Amino acid sequence: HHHHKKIFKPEELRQALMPTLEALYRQDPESLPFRQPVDPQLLGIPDYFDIVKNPMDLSTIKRKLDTGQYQEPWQYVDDVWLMFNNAWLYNRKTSRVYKFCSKLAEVFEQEIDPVMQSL
Ligand SMILES: CO[C@H]1CC[C@H](n2c([C@@H]3C[C@H](F)C(=O)N3c3ccc(F)c(F)c3)nc3cc(-c4c(C)noc4C)ccc32)CC1
């Protein structure tokens, strides 16, 4: 047993972290709201960017893995938490979106720890 200034390759991170991202995409219908960037104009919520200073969604995180924009695995993890925190901050606790956020966050919390241990 062993509970674990380092640099990983894009291929190393995709092999390790894409299966965790795919686990999120497979949660249906819970992932549908997180697949594309929030569009305040389409959704008629011009107050969105007054609460969320830094947008995040699954499509953005998929591009970053796919184009080698992550170098340490904690860079991927922070973006995913940014996505869930944004959603938890902006939406009311009673809304379907907040509860969808909570299910995704559970599913992420219960798979990322082992994956980190393997890197
Ligand atoms: C695939 O097209 C998208 C479907 C979800 C649509 N959507 C919708 C639409 C509008 C309506 F509120 C609604 O019920 N939507 C909705 C549509 C499909 C769903 F599966 C779902 F859970 C919700 N609401 C969204 C909310 C968010 C959101 C997130 C994530 N964090 O803060 C906010 C605000 C994001 C997307 C939302 C936008 C288009």
Sequence-ordered SSE layout with sheet pairings:
Layout (H helix, E strand, L loop, with lengths): L9 H17 L13 H4 L14 H9 L6 H18 L5 H22 L2
Helix pairs in contact: 1-3, 1-5, 3-4, 4-5
Subcellular location: Cytoplasm; Nucleus
Protein name: CREB-binding protein
DSSP helix count?
A: 5
Question: In whole angstroms, how far apart are the ends?
Answer: 14 Å
Which band does the percent of strand residues land in?
under 5%
Largest β-sheet summary: none
The CATH top-level class label: Mainly Alpha
Ligand types: ligand A1L3S
Query: What is the overall silhouette?
Result: globular
CATH topology: Histone Acetyltransferase, Chain A
Query: Can you write the helix and strand succession as a string?
Result: HHHHH
Helix fraction by DSSP (H/I, runs of at least 4): 55-70%
CATH superfamily: Bromodomain-like
Count of separate structural domains: 1
Number of strands: 0
- Going by helix content, strand content and strand pairing, the class is mainly alpha
Q: Give the radius of gyration.
A: 15 Å
CATH architecture: Up-down Bundle
Protein name: CREB-binding protein
Subcellular location: Cytoplasm; Nucleus
